[PDB]
Amino acid sequence: VVGGVV
């Protein structure tokens, strides 16, 4: 899994 970005 990977985190999103802001």
Short mmCIF file of N, CA and C in Angstrom, two decimals:
data_model
loop_
_atom_site.label_atom_id
_atom_site.label_comp_id
_atom_site.label_asym_id
_atom_site.label_seq_id
_atom_site.Cartn_x
_atom_site.Cartn_y
_atom_site.Cartn_z
N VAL A 1 0.89 -1.20 0.00
CA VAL A 1 0.00 0.00 0.00
C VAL A 1 0.90 1.22 0.00
N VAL A 2 0.35 2.35 -0.41
CA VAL A 2 1.09 3.63 -0.40
C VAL A 2 0.15 4.73 0.12
N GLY A 3 0.74 5.69 0.80
CA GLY A 3 0.00 6.89 1.21
C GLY A 3 -0.23 7.81 0.04
N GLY A 4 -1.27 8.62 0.16
CA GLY A 4 -1.54 9.70 -0.78
C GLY A 4 -0.69 10.92 -0.47
N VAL A 5 -1.03 12.01 -1.14
CA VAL A 5 -0.25 13.26 -1.00
C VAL A 5 -1.22 14.42 -0.80
N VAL A 6 -0.73 15.43 -0.09
CA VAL A 6 -1.43 16.72 0.08
C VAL A 6 -0.46 17.85 -0.28
#
